[PDB]
Design an enzyme around this catalytic site. Structure first.
Site, PDB file in Angstrom:
ATOM      1  CE1 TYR A  18     -10.377   0.281  -1.615  1.00  0.00           C
ATOM      2  CE2 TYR A  18      -9.483   2.496  -1.794  1.00  0.00           C
ATOM      3  CZ  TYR A  18      -9.599   1.302  -1.112  1.00  0.00           C
ATOM      4  OH  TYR A  18      -8.935   1.127   0.077  1.00  0.00           O
ATOM      5  NE  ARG A  38     -11.922  -0.074   4.079  1.00  0.00           N
ATOM      6  CZ  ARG A  38     -10.917  -0.566   3.359  1.00  0.00           C
ATOM      7  NH1 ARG A  38     -10.540   0.043   2.241  1.00  0.00           N
ATOM      8  NH2 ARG A  38     -10.290  -1.666   3.752  1.00  0.00           N
ATOM      9  CG  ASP A  69      -2.181  -0.853   0.954  1.00  0.00           C
ATOM     10  OD1 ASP A  69      -2.804  -0.715  -0.120  1.00  0.00           O
ATOM     11  OD2 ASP A  69      -2.517  -1.665   1.840  1.00  0.00           O
ATOM     12  CG  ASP A 108     -17.768  -1.955   3.861  1.00  0.00           C
ATOM     13  OD1 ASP A 108     -17.081  -1.841   2.826  1.00  0.00           O
ATOM     14  OD2 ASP A 108     -17.294  -1.789   5.000  1.00  0.00           O
ATOM     15  NE  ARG A 141     -11.466  -4.566  -1.597  1.00  0.00           N
ATOM     16  CZ  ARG A 141     -10.433  -3.861  -1.149  1.00  0.00           C
ATOM     17  NH1 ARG A 141      -9.371  -3.670  -1.921  1.00  0.00           N
ATOM     18  NH2 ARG A 141     -10.464  -3.348   0.073  1.00  0.00           N
ATOM     19  CD  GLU A 146      -9.986   3.611   1.661  1.00  0.00           C
ATOM     20  OE1 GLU A 146     -10.987   2.865   1.625  1.00  0.00           O
ATOM     21  OE2 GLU A 146      -8.845   3.236   1.323  1.00  0.00           O
TER      22      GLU A 146
HETATM   23  C1  LIG Z   1      -4.263   0.130   5.407  1.00  0.00           C
HETATM   24  O1  LIG Z   1      -5.336  -0.108   4.561  1.00  0.00           O
HETATM   25  C2  LIG Z   1      -6.268   0.880   4.368  1.00  0.00           C
HETATM   26  C3  LIG Z   1      -6.395   1.031   2.895  1.00  0.00           C
HETATM   27  O2  LIG Z   1      -7.038  -0.075   2.291  1.00  0.00           O
HETATM   28  C4  LIG Z   1      -6.691  -0.482   1.001  1.00  0.00           C
HETATM   29  C5  LIG Z   1      -7.601  -1.527   0.459  1.00  0.00           C
HETATM   30  O3  LIG Z   1      -7.362  -2.023  -0.802  1.00  0.00           O
HETATM   31  O4  LIG Z   1      -8.463  -1.988   1.196  1.00  0.00           O
HETATM   32  C6  LIG Z   1      -5.939   0.424   0.024  1.00  0.00           C
HETATM   33  C7  LIG Z   1      -5.145   1.602   0.600  1.00  0.00           C
HETATM   34  N1  LIG Z   1      -3.910   1.956  -0.059  1.00  0.00           N
HETATM   35  C8  LIG Z   1      -3.396   3.292  -0.191  1.00  0.00           C
HETATM   36  N2  LIG Z   1      -4.152   4.362   0.045  1.00  0.00           N
HETATM   37  N3  LIG Z   1      -2.165   3.421  -0.636  1.00  0.00           N
HETATM   38  C9  LIG Z   1      -5.307   1.828   2.129  1.00  0.00           C
HETATM   39  N4  LIG Z   1      -4.750   2.976   2.787  1.00  0.00           N
HETATM   40  C10 LIG Z   1      -3.363   3.210   3.043  1.00  0.00           C
HETATM   41  C11 LIG Z   1      -3.050   4.567   3.585  1.00  0.00           C
HETATM   42  O5  LIG Z   1      -2.533   2.306   3.060  1.00  0.00           O
HETATM   43  C12 LIG Z   1      -7.597   0.588   5.030  1.00  0.00           C
HETATM   44  O6  LIG Z   1      -8.541   1.566   4.791  1.00  0.00           O
HETATM   45  C13 LIG Z   1      -7.442   0.249   6.493  1.00  0.00           C
HETATM   46  O7  LIG Z   1      -6.952   1.308   7.288  1.00  0.00           O
HETATM   47 CA   LIG Z   2     -16.587  -2.902   7.070  1.00  0.00          CA
END
Ligand SMILES: CO[C@@H]([C@@H]1OC(C(=O)O)=C[C@H](NC(=N)N)[C@H]1NC(C)=O)[C@H](O)CO
Ligand SMILES: [Ca+2]
Ligand SMILES: *[C@@H]1O[C@H](CO)[C@@H](O[C@@H]2O[C@H](CO)[C@@H](O)[C@H](O)[C@H]2NC(C)=O)[C@H](O)[C@H]1NC(C)=O
Ligand SMILES: *[C@@H]1O[C@H](CO)[C@@H](O[C@@H]2O[C@H](CO)[C@@H](O)[C@H](O)[C@H]2NC(C)=O)[C@H](O)[C@H]1NC(C)=O
Ligand SMILES: CO[C@@H]([C@@H]1OC(C(=O)O)=C[C@H](NC(=N)N)[C@H]1NC(C)=O)[C@H](O)CO
Ligand SMILES: CO[C@@H]([C@@H]1OC(C(=O)O)=C[C@H](NC(=N)N)[C@H]1NC(C)=O)[C@H](O)CO
Ligand SMILES: CO[C@@H]([C@@H]1OC(C(=O)O)=C[C@H](NC(=N)N)[C@H]1NC(C)=O)[C@H](O)CO
Ligand SMILES: *[C@@H]1O[C@H](CO)[C@@H](O)[C@H](O)[C@H]1NC(C)=O
Ligand SMILES: *[C@@H]1O[C@H](CO)[C@@H](O)[C@H](O)[C@H]1NC(C)=O
Ligand SMILES: *[C@@H]1O[C@H](CO)[C@@H](O)[C@H](O)[C@H]1NC(C)=O
Ligand SMILES: *[C@@H]1O[C@H](CO)[C@@H](O)[C@H](O)[C@H]1NC(C)=O
Ligand SMILES: [Ca+2]
Ligand SMILES: [Ca+2]
Ligand SMILES: [Ca+2]
Ligand SMILES: [Ca+2]
Ligand SMILES: [Ca+2]
Ligand SMILES: [Ca+2]
Ligand SMILES: [Ca+2]
Ligand SMILES: [Ca+2]
Lengths: 387, 387, 387, 387
Positions: free
Chosen positions: A321, A212, A70, A243, A287, A197
């Protein structure tokens, strides 16, 4: 050159007409296309652009290895015209970021890009590509934001950020930004809530966000507020759970639905009085697929009945997403704020046997003329040569 | 359309927020990205651009062979929007050059590109892409210039050039340029000094340059002057030595520090009264890592104490050249000249087993809001397919 | 937006400063670069562009096979900013053509593109990309034109075309064109002369062309004319022979020099009174090397003495076509018409063992400040992967 | 910025001068070029663009597999400047579509893109890239439209759509569109007629369309109408049959010619009184070759005599679809509407042993100056590496 008013109401809509499709992954098989995820769309009074988080690498190259990850120093927020593939040859650089938001106030682009270490991330705010402010992690636990467009009203734009656990109570703040400068913020008093998000949009001078809950809700939390950041909070009551993952449809709750409540996916919904347009995956466990559902009392009612359903992506096809984006009267010439939405189509890890993870996108805009359900999937054939 | 005033003072800053990262080498593994070195950033009232010296070849192609070499007839100065990879498909051609500078006076771009033989190189000056002047080697020994942006004040832009030995006393000249025409120059009377690759910026109508002593100084020489080219010279006194290589931090000197003084790297520093913001590698012996240090009396004081250190690139990661660039009030809307800086991240020869040498870049801008240290390295996996 | 006056005199110059180099072939080894030949440069009041004849194929692809061939239905005239590689991603389409010219009258671009069969070719004239006229072969024997820029004076642009044998007496016509329309033409009465591929430029309201005699002259023929197409003809008298092939320098002639007179190469020269700036290959027998020679009485004098010589491309390096291009005061702000020139660097067949033939380019502009001779060759390593 | 008048008459023309050629397939052998079909050209007051239906894939990539298929969720309408190859790096996204039309009213672009399932397709109308209307299948049998430019007169643009069988009586509707909104439509009362893929142009304030009868006519049906949608219908009477396949030339009919009447190809013709400019394949049985024929009484007369024939593509070379486009006086400065046309050059399946199907294009514009016949074919060498 004038500020978006944002004072008209959201356009009611009966269906969704397809607006764009970039075929990024299919094309990236040969072409020079960024490995990306967390794409989103946002418009100015002149044009609509796709924003996205690159992995600082191209599809079908060895540097796409491990891109399920991520966060890294290599991820950057960039943008290109809507419907075009995200390439180094057609993409504008915005910010260094592994979490982001962006929006146009009618005069210039505001972009927000978060980078740095997990225990001290910093959001860099830019107005017209010039750094105008920063905000640093206050809980030292992965400061993170919308991954979709912020919302602007009369020269002020608004966003939501989260800091703290992904599997328990965290901290959520609302921000008011003017010309790239934070002029006000407030911490939401939301015990037992979880916000991540957020998909936020303007409607009659005020902001509504659908977000979310990664902690313990299979329905989606919401927060709404005026320009002075006086807010209200709740969850979408509909038994048509929004969700992913989630339980099968049944009697819902106006609080967090604990069943299959852990984890989740970024999403959106449009409120119309007691009613709600719900965008969601077709699968309750993964998903896959996407559909739009009109539930006339779904915002405040707990039953699992609905009036309209429109197919967007087949259940046997990958989705991911999704987020709202609006088109203002300053752009359309309409007397209302038009709702549109985008869907990320994720390919690769962890569900597919590749070294990489990336996504393409589709988008739709709300209309009151005739529409049709179908499936507009990613369409790439995996694995690739590099796998 | 108006000349930059350049009469306000440099903005004091408490930290550095990340501004750009291009991931050029990672992308070039597949994409069509120039082999480059000596990149730098410079802005107009409207935009910021990355300038760079190509090797007339692309990454992962056989023509990248031997690109450790500094000078050839194939090297060209080109530019692209900041944060984008330097590609033949997004890059503007500026000049034929193996040494260069560039800056915008508020009306048009001035570019300076030096090419030709080592014993008779010629700097070609362009204003708005039209040749306006030339200056030829006066010591017949590798005429060379900044490799970063020149500095403009009220319609006049200034640069420094060097001619002569890289390992002994050479000759250093300051130039005042108006609409691409040299209107005045003066040779610096600097016996026992050595100046190369100056990073110059405007501050209160005058120019300050921090440069590289390749002869016998592990601290950095500086030269400052008014629009009349009336100058002052010296070395940064701080025991926090700024060059690479260098000794471990200890009592410094206001003259050239002989210890580990031979050789060096292009760098920069920002003067604030007796204080100084020092950008430097983390390693004392190699071009690895990068950090920003605030030393409240480091300009004139010789002790090795400092108040602030911010990490930019980890010590186990490659760095390289670094240079200042500023953003004028005409661009930002601020009441001061904003300090920013870029870092070249060099990959390949001689430290790595490749046939080629190239770099990517990162940049940061000074702010008084919250910031964070981290590491934003190149991130490419070497060797490449061509190696 | 105003018509170029073209009424000032040509700027006298003492030397040539390098202006551009595209490294097209080196880059095409990996990048997507057109196979091209017959490139030329031409400027508007705003910018300078490289025009070129593609072979409807890219370097290092199988469709580059047989591109030594001069004429086909696939060749197209396209253009890109000067110094950039000719790519499908940065090139403007101009016309379908295997012979061409182009020039800007201050308002719009005129392009001339000849295509069709050898026995009935048709020149298509465009003004601002709109077809405005055509002229068809009148001798049914390969209608052909400049392969460099036409010349414009006060809203009228002029070119020369040839039809007939390449190895004997042919027919030569001068054209006056206004807003893309032929308003006048005249056939040159030039028995025993041979004109091809003229390099024409404006000088004091009149046009001077230096061309290629493919029949029996190793010196270059010239034709000059006023706006009413009242012309004069002759050959450059200098014993410094300008064509390729040619004899060793010796006593020249003001008529066609028969020795080594057959065949040739496109070239140029700038007249200054009785004097002449001569651009030519270094080899007398092949398209290798390039040099600029100032011969103070070379236009009208037959001796082989000269005053200045400046190296451009080494004798052991490939060259090819060369042509003049000018920069008008409307572009430069000078009080004279500045002379510049470009050189085509041809690689591949027939001299090299490849399946293809293509070229890169360099350009120089005349100045009165210091300059230097050197060699700026193509620099590609042949053969390529495709060979 | 002003609406196109469209009230002048069509320019009479004596021949066709070549206007563009993109060499898309030849280039796509290496470069990143979309797999496309159904291209067409359309102009604004400022520029001319090539529109096309991508297959959401690039040439010489595995995703080009099976692209003989007409309809899918991956096909998108995109556009690029005329003469350039359709690449992800130079193409603007227009709409998601497997059938399309587009035209400029002098103010903005109207695009029409049909996507969705065969039994319920939806046409999405955009004005300046903003969705303005939709029209859904009314016969639930492959709603389909022009695949060439719509026609605009005084702020109103017009198109034709078909729904129903491809091998029998179907339903045909004319639409009047203003600023992207359908303001009027009428169903053509055409028993025993079949209309598909109309090529429509403006002429003296009224619209003339020449189309494809896929049911039982080897000559082409036509429909003309005023801004009020008051229409007339018929077939081109000439014995010079315009469709493909078709019989050998013989006595024609003013009704549908049954001989070889099934199936067909998109085409066009220009009406001048009783006369007609006919564009058609050279082969009577396959999509090979192309020629322009002037038949002075071919619109209303049934004989097989004609006055002018101009070769465009050799009979041994592949052709395909063809369509009209016009250039208005607002663009050209002429006192009439200029007729131009384009030809699609189809390569691959089903006639060639490849996994893919794609096309390149050529275009010509009508003139009264000298022209020449020739062959400007696709020129690609099949199969490709991917096959
Ligand atoms: C840590 O995972 C978070 C995020 O979740 C995911 C996903 O595919 O579910 C993509 C993101 N990837 C990016 N934005 N780069 C995330 N959010 C981050 C900051 O890692 C989640 O909401 C839990 O806190
Ligand atoms: Ca949930
Ligand atoms: C992507 O990363 C994986 C994991 O590092 C690579 O697979 C490994 O390859 C190395 C070197 O050959 C071996 O030591 C391991 O056994 C492999 N691990 C696994 C799980 O297979 C893979 O080669 C990388 N892919 C690319 C294109 O670089
Ligand atoms: C370019 O053209 C040459 C000549 O046609 C090709 O070389 C020929 O290849 C064919 C098929 O293998 C043979 O029949 C001939 O013996 C070859 N001729 C010669 C002179 O070698 C060559 O393959 C083509 N190159 C590419 C990349 O397509
Ligand atoms: C000779 O080396 C000089 C330059 O050094 C550096 C380097 O990576 O250290 C790269 C340059 N490469 C280019 N600018 N192309 C140089 N400077 C030149 C002119 O070669 C040095 O400052 C000593 O005089
Ligand atoms: C036929 O050769 C003529 C041209 O010569 C050559 C050359 O490399 O010498 C390139 C051209 N290639 C193109 N312009 N495409 C020619 N001219 C043409 C029209 O073939 C010559 O001047 C004799 O008439
Ligand atoms: C079904 O075939 C129709 C179309 O035919 C052709 C063709 O190459 O002949 C290509 C199209 N491809 C696309 N426009 N994508 C078609 N039309 C459609 C809608 O498939 C035909 O006119 C019969 O109704
Ligand atoms: C919305 O804002 C516009 C622009 O200021 C204003 O003129 C108008 O009164 C507002 N509309 C409504 C419905 O209040
Ligand atoms: C700086 O320059 C501006 C522009 O000319 C001028 O108006 C102003 O007085 C100057 N500021 C100071 C502090 O001198
Ligand atoms: C050249 O043309 C300009 C513009 O018309 C005119 O004003 C001027 O008199 C001319 N210059 C000379 C030297 O005749
Ligand atoms: C065509 O339209 C123009 C623009 O309105 C108008 O001025 C002119 O009278 C019309 N021409 C004819 C011949 O009717
Ligand atoms: Ca309900
Ligand atoms: Ca040193
Ligand atoms: Ca100190
Ligand atoms: Ca490639
Ligand atoms: Ca000759
Ligand atoms: Ca002489
Ligand atoms: Ca038919
Ligand atoms: Ca007839």
């Amino acid at each position: 050159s004038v500020k978006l008013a944002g004072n008209s109401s959201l356009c009611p809509v009966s269906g969704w007409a397809i607006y764009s499709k970039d075929n990024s992954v299919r094309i990236g098989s040969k072409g020079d296309v960024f490995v990306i995820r967390e794409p989103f769309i946002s418009c100015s009074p002149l044009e609509c652009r796709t924003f996205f988080l690159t992995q600082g690498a191209l599809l079908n190259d060895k540097h796409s290895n491990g891109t399920i990850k991520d966060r890294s120093p290599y991820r950057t927020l960039m943008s290109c015209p809507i419907g075009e593939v995200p390439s180094p040859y057609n993409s504008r650089f915005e910010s260094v970021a592994w979490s982001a938001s962006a929006c146009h106030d009618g005069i210039n682009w505001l972009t927000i890009g978060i980078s740095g270490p997990d225990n001290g991330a910093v959001a860099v705010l830019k107005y017209n590509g010039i750094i105008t402010d920063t905000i640093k992690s206050w809980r030292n636990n992965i400061l993170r934001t919308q991954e979709s467009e912020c919302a602007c009203v009369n020269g002020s734009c608004f966003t939501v950020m989260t800091d703290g656990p992904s599997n328990g109570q965290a901290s959520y703040k609302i921000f008011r930004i003017e010309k790239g400068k934070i002029v006000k913020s407030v911490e939401m008093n939301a015990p037992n809530y979880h916000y991540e998000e957020c998909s936020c949009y303007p409607d009659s001078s005020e902001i509504t966000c659908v977000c979310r809950d990664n902690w313990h809700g299979s329905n989606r939390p919401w927060v709404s507020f005026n320009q002075n950041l006086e807010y209200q909070i709740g969850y979408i009551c509909s038994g048509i759970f929004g969700d992913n993952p989630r339980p099968n449809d049944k009697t819902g709750s106006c609080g967090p639905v604990s069943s299959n409540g852990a984890n989740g996916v970024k999403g959106f919904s449009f409120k119309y009085g007691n009613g709600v347009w719900i965008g969601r995956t077709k699968s309750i466990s993964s998903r896959n697929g996407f559909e739009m559902i009109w539930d006339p009392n779904g915002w405040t009612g707990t039953d699992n009945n609905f009036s309209i359903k429109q197919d967007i992506v087949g259940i046997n096809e990958w989705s991911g997403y999704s987020g709202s984006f609006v088109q203002h009267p300053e752009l359309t010439g309409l007397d209302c704020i038009r709702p549109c939405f985008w869907v990320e189509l994720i390919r690769g890890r962890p569900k597919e046997n590749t070294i990489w993870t990336s996504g393409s996108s589709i988008s739709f805009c709300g209309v009151n003329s005739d529409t049709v359900g179908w499936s507009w999937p990613d369409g790439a054939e995996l694995p690739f040569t590099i796998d």
